[PDB]
Amino acid sequence: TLNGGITDMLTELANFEKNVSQAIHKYNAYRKAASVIAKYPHKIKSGAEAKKLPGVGTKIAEKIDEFLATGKLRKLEKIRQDDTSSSINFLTRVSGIGPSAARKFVDEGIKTLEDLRKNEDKLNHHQRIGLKYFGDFEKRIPREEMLQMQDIVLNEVKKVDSEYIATVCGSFRRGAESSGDMDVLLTHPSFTSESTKQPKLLHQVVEQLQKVHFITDTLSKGETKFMGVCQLPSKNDEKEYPHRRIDIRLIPKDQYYCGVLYFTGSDIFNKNMRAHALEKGFTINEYTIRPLGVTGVAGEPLPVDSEKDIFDYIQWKYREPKDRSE
DNA sequence: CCGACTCGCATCAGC
DNA sequence: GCTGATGCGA
DNA sequence: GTCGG
Ligand SMILES: Nc1ccn([C@H]2C[C@H](O)[C@@H](COP(=O)(O)CP(=O)(O)OP(=O)(O)O)O2)c(=O)n1
Ligand SMILES: [Cl-]
Ligand SMILES: [Cl-]
Ligand SMILES: [Mn+2]
Ligand SMILES: [Mn+2]
Ligand SMILES: [Mn+2]
Ligand code: NA
Ligand code: NA
């Protein structure tokens, strides 16, 4: 928390550039700066001191000087006051509403939560569910509740087919004391890079979790990726638990390690590692690490028997999940 | 300076 | 219908 | 917005 004011400012600027300006490289630039400063173990006293960190440049350094001097950033103070910016920033907080839809809605005069409720007719299915659970999706998940959810998911999967392996990833696997959502990596021996010998492998699981009233809604669903909503059961006379977002990714069993690396993250950690892989002549996705040939075209998948094998190829020391929270 | 900065699903445009 | 782009998301 | 080359 040494530099919370600064990292908050950069995050707000990042969000502005994504949601309002639609400038995703600026969003990523601010995100990278905020991350590098967040792990900096000194209380930053100057923009010049910050500029020594990779990803902090001259423009961010100047903003840090303004913020250190005054506790504020004029540029943000005015963004906070501009009506369309603030309306756009709000609407993108609904799952399924991005910068595009948010601006179109603001264009048609839909700019408040009440406006959206009045105009449910104009939302696609994802957006309608995001609106329904807007309040619940603001609440974080205590790790203790993550553990109960894990119990349910693992046991329910076992009951569909004992050969399923389900792994909770994301911030949970990084050891976070609370999470924004639950991410589940799924594998089954009938689904490898070489063949899919059983159909419906993800569907069967979604169905089982629906039938025990754990999964309550679906935002998107295909053959390998589910995105929806779930809820812990509550005890007699207790208030219901908040509804929670859940993502499930079925990964070819032989590609578990690249999959678990991807799904564990963080997002920024993945972004940095994939970028470093490129510097080193490889490309990494959730399935494989491949070398880049003399012309920048991916070659054949290299053998991988461990998360560390991936770190090895790109000449990074192994980092435990808990140390990947960038 | 200047080019560069992985993929799944839903939806749409075009045919 | 399919294919490719875009939006939104992990 | 940043930065390797
Ligand atoms: N732009 C992105 C977004 C996500 N991912 C991967 C890495 C991330 O940890 C995982 C879960 O995403 P989530 O969106 O669930 C974020 P997570 O790290 O689980 O933290 P929480 O906020 O507590 O949920 O998906 C990626 O590679 N690139
Ligand atoms: Cl940009
Ligand atoms: Cl691949
Ligand atoms: Mn998560
Ligand atoms: Mn998630
Ligand atoms: Mn609820
Ligand atoms: Na720097
Ligand atoms: Na959104």
Plain-language structure description:
With 326 residues, the protein is an alpha+beta fold. Among the domains are: 141-256, 2-Layer Sandwich (Beta Polymerase, domain 2), CATH 3.30.460.10; 257-323, Beta Polymerase, domain 3 (2-Layer Sandwich). 48% of the residues lie in helices and 13% in strands. It has helices spanning 4-19, 24-38, 47-51, 58-70, 74-81, 83-91, 99-107, 113-118, 125-132, 134-138, 143-160, 170-173, 201-211, 256-264, 267-279, 307-313; strands at 141-142, 165-168, 178-179, 182-187, 191-192, 195-196, 215-221, 225-230, 244-250, 282-284, 289-291. The protein has a five-stranded mixed beta sheet, with helices on both faces. It has a two-stranded antiparallel sheet with strand order 1-3. A two-stranded antiparallel sheet has the order 5-6. Strand 5 and strand 6 form a beta hairpin. The longest helix has 18 residues, at 143-160. The radius of gyration is 22 Å and the shape is globular. The relative contact order is 0.08. The chain binds the ligand Nc1ccn([C@H]2C[C@H](O)[C@@H](COP(=O)(O)CP(=O)(O)OP(=O)(O)O)O2)c(=O)n1, chloride ion (2 copies), manganese (II) ion (3 copies) and sodium ion (2 copies). One chloride ion binds at residues 285, 287-288. It binds three DNA strands through helix 2, helix 4, helix 7, strand 7 and helix 15. DATP binds at residues 140, 171, 174, 180-181.
The CATH class designation of the domain at 141-256 is Alpha Beta
Number of helices: 16
- Portion in strands: 5-15%
Task: Tell me the series of helices and strands, N- to C-terminal.
Answer: HHHHHHHHHHEHEHEEEEHEEEHHEEH
Intertermini distance: 14 Å
Radius of gyration computed on alpha carbons: 22 Å
Shape: globular
- CATH level-two architecture of the domain at 141-256: 2-Layer Sandwich
Helix content: 40-55%
| Biggest β-sheet description | 5 strands, mixed
Instruction: Report strand order across the widest sheet.
Output: 2-4-9-8-7
Q: CATH homologous superfamily name of the domain at 141-256?
A: Beta Polymerase, domain 2
SS-derived structural category: alpha+beta
The counted number of beta strands is: 11
The hetero molecules present are: the ligand Nc1ccn([C@H]2C[C@H](O)[C@@H](COP(=O)(O)CP(=O)(O)OP(=O)(O)O)O2)c(=O)n1, chloride ion, manganese (II) ion, sodium ion
If you consult CATH, what is the topology of the domain at 141-256? Beta Polymerase, domain 2
Subunit structure: Monomer. Binds single-stranded DNA (ssDNA). Interacts with APEX1, LIG1, LIG3, FEN1, PCNA and XRCC1. Interacts with HUWE1/ARF-BP1, STUB1/CHIP and USP47. Interacts with FAM168A.
Modified residues (Omega-N-methylarginine): 74, 143
Binding site for dATP: 140, 171, 174, 180-181
Subcellular location: Nucleus; Cytoplasm
